[PDB]
Write a protein that binds this ligand. Structure first.
Ligand SMILES: [Mg+2]
Ligand SMILES: [Mg+2]
Ligand code: NA
Ligand code: NA
Lengths: 356, 356
């Protein structure tokens, strides 16, 4: 691990169904590490921002550094550029993937070990054309997927209720989660949440804008259905604040928000210390990001509500991995191979790139 | 790391100057892992309690497990036996040491990498015969040690003041820290702490009993000298409570309290999130425990006040490692070799054992 990182390559991809930024690091010894940043322009930041963060601001910080100084590198990285937690997460992933390759260890082994070999998978239901999702749900049920998360709030309230009712009638096999993606306005939050809570989903995710800690805390006191914070919490700092103000019953943890795998674990551990639950959320990512999140969760017993790394299997027309992101009988398979467990395909990276 | 742990050997040692419990784990392939539990009877527990914890209660959940399932093993261990955080730290150390030997990596490499190659060392000054400490301080200054921590409260207040004045006069080269070890009673806490604070030590450690959160918080508001919590904080759970009640400005982190290296890091990270400083404390341990503590601090940027792994160098007549715990120019050296960086001497373990 005394080896020096000698190169940094980047790709700004546009995947048919979704833009992401892929990073590759190369050590003196020839080993390579991959990492993905999956920005959501309106929430975490743009792909351009993360591309620049890596290409111009973090590059000088990483090139020439020893693979083993990851802790120092990530500490400096957080301060070297503002935001771009997706880019920071990509760097951490590549650093870990690289160290894992060098030492011949899976990433979870560099995160403390593993506590689970599989992770329950959840697929989101967010199509404005519900008939298309019904067909999707038929397939999900057939594939053994047992969890689904209804994206709510993007249309009228009636549209949300309609779907919950049909799901309960024709797809009772699934456990159902709900996610508003900060979608509701102040004047409609309470009545819409209270109505949806009647359906008793496993949890309702972030009904209002991230900065609405007061309102989130109030919504939490309205029903016994768990209220999960997502956009309101990125890292440990926000988690401490969220816990203090009692804005949620649990949190959706994403490496793209925490800016790294360790910071993601810290969020989960702080949530647990406050008696709050944790879920493996994700952004609109590809298989590389899925693998990074999978290794993180495999080493974090505190995240018990499953994960939602469903895009590579049900959203993207084609993924960027050389080998399919492994999911069997509705469960994500924790890889045990070196590094992340799969390489990104250069040809696909070259083909789908809009910039590199 | 898929291979199983097939054996657990224990030694309750009595080291001339100190009792500790040493643990050795053996994997199917023959690799070994060593860990140390350094119990303090009146604070953390007895060596007999920790010996029993490992020998009878943790043995069953460890034997037959995959080396790589460390996270799950430790999660289960914490609940398998009450207290005995020292035994838990020893098990975590052995598991990490074992995994390091297998993968040929330094323990810090399994804790996320490193951010520092050396750690400033502090030696405690606690001899009731102060002339003996003056001699030691002469030795300390010559060896390049620039930090010392005065053990206060075990005698009258005059004795503490006497030593603080002589140190400032004859040994100005040292940065001075103070530690009461919960030694002060309620009716004498304010006056004594105020007097000592006039000497502006770097920090004053745990003036009163661990359970006195309210009193600790009041003491914190009396001076601008940092008040460190030690016995009041063992793990993440205590750190969350201590931060909420504002009982300190910083915390002394010890693996023997946190019951593991990761838990110790979580304590440091939580403190930092609350704007509280962190110090690398220790119990009356030997070189094996010092190495575990060194690797954890090596991977934890949040711990910036140095460490006190001085016993192997200045307290124990003889250490148990095959090679000296490295300290150069008053700085602890972070090992880069496989595992903890040194091996326990089978012959010494047998010689100093009072039970095995
Ligand atoms: Mg969400
Ligand atoms: Mg102390
Ligand atoms: Na509630
Ligand atoms: Na103060």
């Amino acid at each position: 691990l005394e080896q020096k990182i000698i190169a940094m390559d980047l790709w700004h991809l546009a995947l048919p169904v979704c833009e992401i930024v892929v990073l590759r690091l190369v050590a003196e010894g020839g080993a390579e590490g991959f990492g993905e940043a999956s920005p959501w322009a309106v929430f975490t930041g743009t792909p351009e921002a993360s591309y620049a963060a890596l290409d111009r601001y973090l590059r000088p910080l990483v090139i020439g550094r020893r693979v083993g100084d990851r802790v120092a590198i990530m500490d400096e990285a957080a301060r070297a550029v503002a935001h771009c937690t997706e880019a920071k997460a990509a760097l951490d992933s590549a650093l870990l993937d690289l160290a894992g390759r060098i030492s011949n260890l899976p990433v979870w082994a560099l995160l403390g070990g593993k506590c689970r070999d599989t992770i329950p998978l959840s697929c989101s239901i967010a199509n404005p054309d519900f008939d298309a999702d019904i067909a999707l749900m038929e397939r999900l049920r057939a594939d053994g997927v047992g969890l689904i998360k209804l994206k709510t709030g993007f249309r009228d309230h009636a549209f949300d209720i309609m779907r919950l009712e049909l799901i309960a009638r024709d797809f009772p096999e699934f456990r159902v989660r709900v996610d508003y993606n900060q979608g509701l306005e102040i004047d409609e939050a309470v009545p819409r949440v209270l109505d949806v809570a009647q359906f008793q989903p496993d949890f309702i995710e972030q009904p209002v804008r991230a900065h609405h800690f007061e309102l989130m805390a109030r919504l939490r006191g309205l029903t016994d259905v768990p209220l999960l914070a997502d956009e309101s919490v990125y890292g440990p700092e926000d988690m401490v604040r969220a816990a203090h103000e009692g804005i949620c019953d649990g949190v959706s943890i994403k490496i793209m928000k925490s800016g790294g795998l360790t910071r993601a674990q810290t969020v989960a551990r702080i949530a647990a210390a406050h008696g709050l639950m944790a879920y493996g959320g994700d952004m609109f990512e590809a298989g590389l990001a899925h693998l990074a999140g999978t290794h993180m969760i495999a080493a974090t017993p505190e995240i018990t509500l499953g994960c939602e790394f469903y895009q590579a299997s049900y959203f993207l027309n084609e993924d960027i991995l050389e080998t399919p992101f492994r999911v069997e009988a509705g469960q994500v398979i924790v890889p045990d191979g070196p590094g992340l467990g799969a390489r990104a395909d250069p040809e696909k990276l070259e083909h789908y790139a809009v910039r590199r």
